[PDB]
Amino acid sequence: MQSIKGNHLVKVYDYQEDGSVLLTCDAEAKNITWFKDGKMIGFLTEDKKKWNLGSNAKDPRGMYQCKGSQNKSKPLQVYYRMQTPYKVSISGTTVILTCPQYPGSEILWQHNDKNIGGDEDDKNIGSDEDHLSLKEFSELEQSGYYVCYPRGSKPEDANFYLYLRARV
């Protein structure tokens, strides 16, 4: 989530005074090239480097990846609601997240670099195979990066992290 290890150089700049979603690219600044769903959405030649996806009220979504002088970085699944991507399902105040890769192994989940869904002592947090359910969703507290990985693998080895921002 916070670390860019694993080619996950795409991060959300959560320092916007307005409800605009700003994305940052962790690459050696020479020229920043941005992609959206594999298709390039812009090319920043020095100067500015953050990519504006517009107001967060527009529910921006897609797989955005950046590229400097090296190869393109790993994708960052954006899911705003105010390769197979992670599946987000919202029912009332309940949000369900699905691991894109479910080889049938014990899939572990992490939210803001903190494991979640392991202990059963949380009634509002349940894990069912590759399905992560979040009841009574808090917009300010549970939003952020999410990543799923089978037990044994590294979270940084995931193909992409899911940044969830939903107002329920």
């Binding site: 080889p103 049938g104 192994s105 014990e106 392991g118 202990d119 059963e120 894990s127 195979e129 089978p150 037990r151 044994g152």
Partner: peptide, 12 residues
């Protein structure tokens, strides 16, 4: 395979 003692999840 593996079995998670805390959750009971099994993979094979």
């Amino acid at each position: 395979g593996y079995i998670n003692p805390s959750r009971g999840y099994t993979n094979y």
